[PDB]
Design a protein around this ligand. Sequence first.
Ligand SMILES: *[C@@H]1O[C@H](CO)[C@@H](O[C@@H]2O[C@H](CO)[C@@H](O[C@H]3O[C@H](CO)[C@@H](O)[C@H](O)[C@@H]3O)[C@H](O)[C@H]2NC(C)=O)[C@H](O)[C@H]1NC(C)=O
Ligand SMILES: *[C@@H]1O[C@H](CO)[C@@H](O[C@@H]2O[C@H](CO)[C@@H](O[C@H]3O[C@H](CO)[C@@H](O)[C@H](O)[C@@H]3O)[C@H](O)[C@H]2NC(C)=O)[C@H](O)[C@H]1NC(C)=O
Ligand SMILES: *[C@@H]1O[C@H](CO)[C@@H](O[C@@H]2O[C@H](CO)[C@@H](O[C@H]3O[C@H](CO)[C@@H](O)[C@H](O)[C@@H]3O)[C@H](O)[C@H]2NC(C)=O)[C@H](O)[C@H]1NC(C)=O
Ligand SMILES: *[C@@H]1O[C@H](CO)[C@@H](O[C@@H]2O[C@H](CO)[C@@H](O[C@H]3O[C@H](CO)[C@@H](O)[C@H](O)[C@@H]3O)[C@H](O)[C@H]2NC(C)=O)[C@H](O)[C@H]1NC(C)=O
Ligand SMILES: *[C@@H]1O[C@H](CO)[C@@H](O[C@@H]2O[C@H](CO)[C@@H](O[C@H]3O[C@H](CO)[C@@H](O)[C@H](O)[C@@H]3O)[C@H](O)[C@H]2NC(C)=O)[C@H](O)[C@H]1NC(C)=O
Ligand SMILES: *[C@@H]1O[C@H](CO)[C@@H](O[C@@H]2O[C@H](CO)[C@@H](O[C@H]3O[C@H](CO)[C@@H](O)[C@H](O)[C@@H]3O)[C@H](O)[C@H]2NC(C)=O)[C@H](O)[C@H]1NC(C)=O
Ligand SMILES: *[C@@H]1O[C@H](CO)[C@@H](O[C@@H]2O[C@H](CO)[C@@H](O)[C@H](O)[C@H]2NC(C)=O)[C@H](O)[C@H]1NC(C)=O
Ligand SMILES: *[C@@H]1O[C@H](CO)[C@@H](O[C@@H]2O[C@H](CO)[C@@H](O)[C@H](O)[C@H]2NC(C)=O)[C@H](O)[C@H]1NC(C)=O
Ligand SMILES: *[C@@H]1O[C@H](CO)[C@@H](O[C@@H]2O[C@H](CO)[C@@H](O)[C@H](O)[C@H]2NC(C)=O)[C@H](O)[C@H]1NC(C)=O
Ligand SMILES: *[C@@H]1O[C@H](CO)[C@@H](O)[C@H](O)[C@H]1NC(C)=O
Ligand SMILES: *[C@@H]1O[C@H](CO)[C@@H](O)[C@H](O)[C@H]1NC(C)=O
Ligand SMILES: *[C@@H]1O[C@H](CO)[C@@H](O)[C@H](O)[C@H]1NC(C)=O
Ligand SMILES: *[C@@H]1O[C@H](CO)[C@@H](O)[C@H](O)[C@H]1NC(C)=O
Ligand SMILES: *[C@@H]1O[C@H](CO)[C@@H](O)[C@H](O)[C@H]1NC(C)=O
Ligand SMILES: *[C@@H]1O[C@H](CO)[C@@H](O)[C@H](O)[C@H]1NC(C)=O
Ligand SMILES: *[C@@H]1O[C@H](CO)[C@@H](O)[C@H](O)[C@H]1NC(C)=O
Ligand SMILES: *[C@@H]1O[C@H](CO)[C@@H](O)[C@H](O)[C@H]1NC(C)=O
Ligand SMILES: *[C@@H]1O[C@H](CO)[C@@H](O)[C@H](O)[C@H]1NC(C)=O
Ligand SMILES: *[C@H]1O[C@H](CO)[C@@H](O)[C@H](O)[C@H]1NC(C)=O
Ligand SMILES: *[C@H]1O[C@H](CO)[C@@H](O)[C@H](O)[C@H]1NC(C)=O
Ligand SMILES: *[C@H]1O[C@H](CO)[C@@H](O)[C@H](O)[C@H]1NC(C)=O
Lengths: 491, 491, 491
Amino acid sequence: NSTATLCLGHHAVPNGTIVKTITNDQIEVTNATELVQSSSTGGICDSPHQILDGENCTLIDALLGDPQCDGFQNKKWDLFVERSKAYSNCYPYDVPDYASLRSLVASSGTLEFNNESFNWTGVTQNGTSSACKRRSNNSFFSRLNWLTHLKFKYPALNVTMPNNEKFDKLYIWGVHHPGTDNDQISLYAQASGRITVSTKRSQQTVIPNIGSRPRVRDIPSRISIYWTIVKPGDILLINSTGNLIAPRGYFKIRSGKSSIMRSDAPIGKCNSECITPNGSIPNDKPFQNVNRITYGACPRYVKQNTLKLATGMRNVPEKQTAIAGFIENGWEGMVDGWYGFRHQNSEGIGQAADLKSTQAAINQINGKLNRLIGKTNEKFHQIEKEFSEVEGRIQDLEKYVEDTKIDLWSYNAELLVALENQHTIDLTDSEMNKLFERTKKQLRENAEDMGNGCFKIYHKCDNACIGSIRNGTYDHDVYRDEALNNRFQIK
Amino acid sequence: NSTATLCLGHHAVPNGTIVKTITNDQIEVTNATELVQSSSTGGICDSPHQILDGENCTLIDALLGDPQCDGFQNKKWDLFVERSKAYSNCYPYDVPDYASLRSLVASSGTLEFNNESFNWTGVTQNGTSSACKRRSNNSFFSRLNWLTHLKFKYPALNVTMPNNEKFDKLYIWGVHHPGTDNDQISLYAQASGRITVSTKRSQQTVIPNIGSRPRVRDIPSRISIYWTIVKPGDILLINSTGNLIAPRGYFKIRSGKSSIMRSDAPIGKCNSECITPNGSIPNDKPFQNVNRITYGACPRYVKQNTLKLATGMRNVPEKQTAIAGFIENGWEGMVDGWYGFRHQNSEGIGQAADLKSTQAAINQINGKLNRLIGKTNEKFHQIEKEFSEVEGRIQDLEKYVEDTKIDLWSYNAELLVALENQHTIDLTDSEMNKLFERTKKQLRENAEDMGNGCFKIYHKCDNACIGSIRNGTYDHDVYRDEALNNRFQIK
Amino acid sequence: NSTATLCLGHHAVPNGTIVKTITNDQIEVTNATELVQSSSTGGICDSPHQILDGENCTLIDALLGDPQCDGFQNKKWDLFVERSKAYSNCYPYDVPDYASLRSLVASSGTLEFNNESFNWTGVTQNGTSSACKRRSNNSFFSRLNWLTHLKFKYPALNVTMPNNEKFDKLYIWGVHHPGTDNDQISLYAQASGRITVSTKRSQQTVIPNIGSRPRVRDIPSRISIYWTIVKPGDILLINSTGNLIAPRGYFKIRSGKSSIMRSDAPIGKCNSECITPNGSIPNDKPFQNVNRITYGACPRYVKQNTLKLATGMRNVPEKQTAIAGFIENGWEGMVDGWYGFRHQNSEGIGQAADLKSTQAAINQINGKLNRLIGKTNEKFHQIEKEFSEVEGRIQDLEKYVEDTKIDLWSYNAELLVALENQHTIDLTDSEMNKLFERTKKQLRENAEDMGNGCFKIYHKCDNACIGSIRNGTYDHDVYRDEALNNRFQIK
Ligand SMILES: *[C@@H]1O[C@H](CO)[C@@H](O[C@@H]2O[C@H](CO)[C@@H](O[C@H]3O[C@H](CO)[C@@H](O)[C@H](O)[C@@H]3O)[C@H](O)[C@H]2NC(C)=O)[C@H](O)[C@H]1NC(C)=O
Ligand SMILES: *[C@@H]1O[C@H](CO)[C@@H](O[C@@H]2O[C@H](CO)[C@@H](O[C@H]3O[C@H](CO)[C@@H](O)[C@H](O)[C@@H]3O)[C@H](O)[C@H]2NC(C)=O)[C@H](O)[C@H]1NC(C)=O
Ligand SMILES: *[C@@H]1O[C@H](CO)[C@@H](O[C@@H]2O[C@H](CO)[C@@H](O[C@H]3O[C@H](CO)[C@@H](O)[C@H](O)[C@@H]3O)[C@H](O)[C@H]2NC(C)=O)[C@H](O)[C@H]1NC(C)=O
Ligand SMILES: *[C@@H]1O[C@H](CO)[C@@H](O[C@@H]2O[C@H](CO)[C@@H](O[C@H]3O[C@H](CO)[C@@H](O)[C@H](O)[C@@H]3O)[C@H](O)[C@H]2NC(C)=O)[C@H](O)[C@H]1NC(C)=O
Ligand SMILES: *[C@@H]1O[C@H](CO)[C@@H](O[C@@H]2O[C@H](CO)[C@@H](O[C@H]3O[C@H](CO)[C@@H](O)[C@H](O)[C@@H]3O)[C@H](O)[C@H]2NC(C)=O)[C@H](O)[C@H]1NC(C)=O
Ligand SMILES: *[C@@H]1O[C@H](CO)[C@@H](O[C@@H]2O[C@H](CO)[C@@H](O[C@H]3O[C@H](CO)[C@@H](O)[C@H](O)[C@@H]3O)[C@H](O)[C@H]2NC(C)=O)[C@H](O)[C@H]1NC(C)=O
Ligand SMILES: *[C@@H]1O[C@H](CO)[C@@H](O[C@@H]2O[C@H](CO)[C@@H](O)[C@H](O)[C@H]2NC(C)=O)[C@H](O)[C@H]1NC(C)=O
Ligand SMILES: *[C@@H]1O[C@H](CO)[C@@H](O[C@@H]2O[C@H](CO)[C@@H](O)[C@H](O)[C@H]2NC(C)=O)[C@H](O)[C@H]1NC(C)=O
Ligand SMILES: *[C@@H]1O[C@H](CO)[C@@H](O[C@@H]2O[C@H](CO)[C@@H](O)[C@H](O)[C@H]2NC(C)=O)[C@H](O)[C@H]1NC(C)=O
Ligand SMILES: *[C@@H]1O[C@H](CO)[C@@H](O)[C@H](O)[C@H]1NC(C)=O
Ligand SMILES: *[C@@H]1O[C@H](CO)[C@@H](O)[C@H](O)[C@H]1NC(C)=O
Ligand SMILES: *[C@@H]1O[C@H](CO)[C@@H](O)[C@H](O)[C@H]1NC(C)=O
Ligand SMILES: *[C@@H]1O[C@H](CO)[C@@H](O)[C@H](O)[C@H]1NC(C)=O
Ligand SMILES: *[C@@H]1O[C@H](CO)[C@@H](O)[C@H](O)[C@H]1NC(C)=O
Ligand SMILES: *[C@@H]1O[C@H](CO)[C@@H](O)[C@H](O)[C@H]1NC(C)=O
Ligand SMILES: *[C@@H]1O[C@H](CO)[C@@H](O)[C@H](O)[C@H]1NC(C)=O
Ligand SMILES: *[C@@H]1O[C@H](CO)[C@@H](O)[C@H](O)[C@H]1NC(C)=O
Ligand SMILES: *[C@@H]1O[C@H](CO)[C@@H](O)[C@H](O)[C@H]1NC(C)=O
Ligand SMILES: *[C@H]1O[C@H](CO)[C@@H](O)[C@H](O)[C@H]1NC(C)=O
Ligand SMILES: *[C@H]1O[C@H](CO)[C@@H](O)[C@H](O)[C@H]1NC(C)=O
Ligand SMILES: *[C@H]1O[C@H](CO)[C@@H](O)[C@H](O)[C@H]1NC(C)=O
């Protein structure tokens, strides 16, 4: 009756979600999204990375050429997957610095092997063992050559192999440690002596040590495995009087992005960029709590099992019953916008969404989602993060480096989400305040602020008039005479 | 006279404290609290962690069973404390990879030892030395067995010990390096030869080397110490023709949270969660500058010696002498609240605190104190961070890892406190501004803003009227006629 | 005509720069500065750090005393620079743990050597080789002493050297591995046997191994290099029957801030605190993308090639043509301040800068520049970050530590600049808003807000009157009668 009411407000939802900001440990917002990936399918997807499932073979078994690993010859991988069931089924061996040879072959990503014609004049080649059956016959590691006496002579070997290629050569070789003095004479025709394998830049001398070790697959002897990398222009020289498990050639050694992972997860026909030992995981989220061991474009590992990013404003219940604006009060009935107007005039009570303010909030929230979602970075060969044996110093360092990293990332994640959520609350509160201020400024002296997010408009203000305010075309001068008379009247 | 004044304000204190924010390198606030712990009592509290004071013994001396360490037999610890006065008082020895054996025993946290009956048929057991006195008699390491010839024979040993337990066994053994060829024959009846200690998964061969070393406690000979871990289902095999310092059994090897620390701090009868080499430190603060070496629930080490967290608003002097509000002006006389009202009316000049605004600020400050104070996390065995010898590569890495970590934490601490302090200044400024806005809205057209944080109320406004404003029950309509007449009058 | 207009505004520039904030991926500001150093001069400045250019010598070659390195005797450095052209020109050698000896000498920063008189009674000293020419004559490493038989006898050596100094001694020594059994007898008069070098705290036994290696500078033999540090109160004991390459004395070993760097950059006569392999770089900026390898007071390495810090407000085009204020509108014509006033009155249209607001913004921006610019911290000897050989485990860890560090710093840099830029936008927006509010408060009921950052002043307001508003001396009471009549009139 001679006046109207115009309220500014924002939506509210019946099912809000709790997030953390800098101001509040817990504040309910209209919507949020999870930033920590905590589930895996449980399978390793065979795309888009080239997976090599080791099955019963370790990488080192496949390198040496254990008969059950013959199918692996010359294969390449992005990721070699080693299974806990894996077992050796040839001559018992050890590798001093096993972890390093495993790592360097894993990182190279290839088992490509080129045979070479070493001059083994004066000895017997191709020694075999019942401990290493191939197609039901006594055999040996495919890539190694067990040399033994010929006619009870084993003349001193002094054998050369130049690298005349433009790439490096990786040589794998070994030293046989016989169980008894009888086996030594029976195999090499003389007492044990050192083996020296050298290049222009390196030398390795190894002493065969006769003696029974506990039997493994009925064998009390051992082979110790060594490696030598030979550069272009360098030469491999092998010097021995027995006990030599000779190379048959060299492996290519490449550089690139290959690695190795211990997992029992099945390999599936599917496509996922991020692999963990638990299986492939989606990489849309910036963080994950599935496993510290990862390969590919992966979220970063954090300790938190959930971090919720606000994707809407503060959620505020509608106060119980005269229309009312945003002051301590959301509008559950506003479903076509985030901010808007309610009015009361001669023609009834109405509501309209404000598109500009709503879109400004939505655009900014989508902006931060764009920075955080689907933006993971790739990592490849790293360090080991689980250990089956006690080792002391080096392992203490590996563990401390990883613990240190995870705590720093977990801190960055916690702070980032608290800061972003505070900013979301601030920017959404700000759109509400700006809408209110813009309206106040249009109305000039024709309205008063009622203190509840509403204006009392001191003139008849029909539907078109209200629309003019909402649309930014209200001309205050048209109504000012009427309004000033109504406002400043002695009652 | 026909009008009143109502001012909004906030407290101020005579003794404020300087903090850093994002906006200001130095800003005075009413109160602050220290976040960096920089003092220790100087003693290690014997509760709640199980402390083992090594006194004159290193952990390795206590392991081997140096006579002065007999009291340590079978003890466990959370933290083994090694003293700089510690010294060896038995046969001179070295441990290749001493640091790793020390670390693995420290982390295991137990000296539990189980004797076993090795079959040493054909040799003399229990060799003793004047360099290792026990109760004034020639003796030897309690856990080791010095075998020597019997009737001038030392038959080849080939001795086995199966692990039929469900847990791992740690074996400690040694190789004696005699000073002279005479001692070799006198002890073992024959020239030196290798010792091989093996399992199904490992082998270690060690060569005794005869020769004088510089005398230590009058002994030119040495013992070199080795270790072997034997898994359930595996077997220890010892193969020797002399120079064997044999094990008498095995140590349990456990996993858990135990460690070792070098400190000369006395042990006290007190209770503290965080231990450093300088002594236990309180763990209420999130950061500390006492020592990078810590054990237990400890603040994080940072380089800063002080970081002050604001726990009150900006501290603003009261301007010198008509009442005045918060614009460039604090109220030292307001002692029962942080924010409030001063008024001038017919009945005098009065002050009242506003509880709501005051409590809102206090609650939020207490919130952040709750996140930061008494919330430290536990760490246990880590890496070494001080070194008595020059070593090169591995030590360079250990040092770089720790330096890297400390610089990253020191940065996080600096940023966190600057951000929190900025937020405290913002939230306390905001409570003042909201109080002023709420008041302005109640007053409607009955008052004007004087620009100094005060309103000129254009009607008679007695004590009850002022109280109604403060209490949120002022009805502007009652006074509007009077106020509009006073405001809009030709003077 | 009976009224005036007063607009508040801020400057704008024709050539703004894009930065990133928390709110906007891209926002144009009036000015910015680069925080990532991405160029080097290409030369290493010889000041203020003491540089030692290795030229054709590695540090280890200079240590041993290869003839071409004689000029390096006893020199010290802060930074030893090793060139890729460097080559050895003496007897072929290897150093087991080369990387550690290189590191410990590099970090010590001195080649100071003190000769000592070892008692080599019974052997020939000063062996020479055609592979190691000095001044066209057969020679040998300057710091080593090749002992050979005397009259076809080489009596067992058992030689002592006490450390009676107050500092540690570094001894470098070697073992000769002859190409053939003939050379062994010709040099040492008997078959090879072990060398033992010991102290009270350490022992090292090395076995000479006869055999041809591939010829290097026509030599099939090798020398293997070892080192021993002897403490005050300890004694060096050398025990040998041949193959000993003896020390002539000891190196001082110091602690301090020295290091070593691989670079081919020329050394220049200039002064720069920060050295990288690409050359010295300026250290004004907090970050750099030139090289992860640094020495001295250096910006921190990050992955980003640019991070722009805002040093001015948001840059907003001037809207096209009645004066207008800051609402969606900058003033390109304001060149003597950042914020100001434009007015329209009886005497024309004028502009004046507001010094206070302008200086408040400038001071705060200079504050953050002061924290970020010219504030780098020094680092010295670190870890290696590039590798010429494949090694496996230890190298994997070194690489992972550095990758981890760089990713954490790159994250901190990205967040810091986004936060600072958001704060700059906020503080500059705030100065504009405060200026507007201060003005509004002075005007009281004499003006209305037109919604475009301008006031309509409802009285005649001449140049002095406008000046009084700008200067903060406007007395609203003088004009209130006139203004209220103009505002509240029936039109
Ligand atoms: C609460 O917040 C969420 C993030 O803003 C939001 O999830 C987003 O929803 C959209 C639409 O469903 C998804 O986008 C999809 O839309 C196109 C349409 O053309 C599809 O073709 C695409 O496949 C695309 O996936 C987003 O993926 C999704 N974003 C995230 C991070 O989950 C929810 O909708 C919001 N919930 C409520 C109740 O409002
Ligand atoms: C040193 O001690 C070792 C452990 O006692 C011993 O190894 C054991 O040797 C026996 C006999 O060869 C093996 O027993 C085998 O006996 C028959 C022989 O026909 C076989 O058919 C069976 O397979 C049966 O296993 C043990 O297996 C073996 N024990 C271990 C742990 O390896 C060495 O022989 C001894 N060495 C010397 C040089 O005497
Ligand atoms: C300045 O800021 C400090 C942090 O807000 C504040 O210190 C806090 O003071 C309280 C009360 O003295 C301490 O809490 C104690 O109160 C209960 C009462 O039931 C005692 O029973 C407990 O023992 C408890 O310790 C807090 O410990 C203390 N907090 C911190 C972090 O120090 C100061 O009081 C403030 N100073 C001024 C002048 O206002
Ligand atoms: C190789 O050289 C070593 C150093 O010269 C030498 O060690 C020294 O041996 C002497 C004589 O045994 C010790 O001197 C001791 O002399 C009397 C003997 O009755 C003792 O009562 C005293 O305690 C006195 O110390 C030295 O202590 C000892 N020096 C060191 C540094 O250990 C070796 O004996 C030599 N080795 C051979 C095989 O000849
Ligand atoms: C845009 O932002 C830049 C940072 O605010 C600013 O650069 C700064 O400019 C000053 C003045 O040219 C330089 O300071 C120099 O001034 C004294 C005068 O006594 C000289 O004697 C000194 O040598 C000193 O270098 C600053 O060095 C410089 N700061 C930085 C970080 O670059 C630009 O001027 C600004 N550009 C525009 C167009 O406004
Ligand atoms: C073991 O095999 C080695 C490689 O075949 C061999 O080394 C080679 O020795 C020959 C002959 O001494 C060297 O050839 C040199 O021949 C004349 C001799 O007058 C010299 O003037 C030339 O400089 C020419 O180089 C090879 O250089 C050398 N090859 C390598 C790679 O070092 C060893 O001699 C053999 N060892 C034994 C004990 O027989
Ligand atoms: C390396 O090869 C050389 C031969 O090229 C070996 O030297 C011969 O060894 C035999 C058997 O011990 C001796 O009878 C000959 O007199 C040696 N020949 C020469 C020319 O010296 C040498 O033993 C091999 N080395 C090793 C460690 O196996
Ligand atoms: C390991 O033990 C075996 C015996 O079980 C040793 O072999 C005997 O050694 C003696 C003395 O050298 C010889 O006379 C015998 O002929 C060997 N017996 C057999 C069955 O071969 C062997 O020496 C021990 N090994 C070590 C390194 O000590
Ligand atoms: C270390 O020095 C001692 C002498 O001080 C050497 O022992 C002598 O060695 C010779 C030659 O082998 C023997 O004939 C003598 O009988 C030994 N003398 C004594 C007193 O035992 C010993 O060989 C040297 N050790 C090494 C590894 O070179
Ligand atoms: C692996 O070994 C198991 C156990 O011997 C065997 O049954 C299985 O068939 C093997 N798998 C492959 C792929 O060879
Ligand atoms: C993944 O495997 C690790 C290692 O066994 C386990 O700790 C973790 O709970 C697993 N996570 C999920 C989501 O399966
Ligand atoms: C736009 O403005 C006009 C008045 O100029 C108003 O009547 C109309 O309803 C407005 N349209 C909308 C969609 O708000
Ligand atoms: C430790 O050794 C010192 C020096 O011999 C001795 O006086 C002290 O009593 C010893 N302390 C213990 C606890 O055995
Ligand atoms: C603690 O001990 C360390 C190491 O000696 C020393 O640097 C530091 O000053 C000590 N700190 C305190 C508070 O005693
Ligand atoms: C509460 O409001 C009444 C007026 O309705 C006022 O007079 C009274 O003083 C107020 N009480 C307080 C404690 O401010
Ligand atoms: C380094 O070696 C090269 C190649 O022999 C030589 O020409 C040059 O003069 C040498 N430089 C110095 C400084 O000795
Ligand atoms: C510096 O050298 C490194 C290593 O070769 C190279 O990657 C980088 O591009 C160089 N940077 C500059 C600015 O020259
Ligand atoms: C200062 O204030 C006076 C009026 O009191 C005004 O007329 C004068 O122009 C002002 N000066 C400036 C520099 O603004
Ligand atoms: C092993 O070498 C022999 C030469 O003795 C060669 O002819 C043969 O092809 C090889 N044997 C096998 C089974 O590959
Ligand atoms: C050492 O072993 C003997 C067997 O020779 C045993 O009887 C005795 O208990 C042991 N000696 C000591 C002092 O413990
Ligand atoms: C090497 O030692 C001899 C003693 O045999 C000494 O006189 C001479 O100075 C030394 N020779 C050289 C070339 O320095």
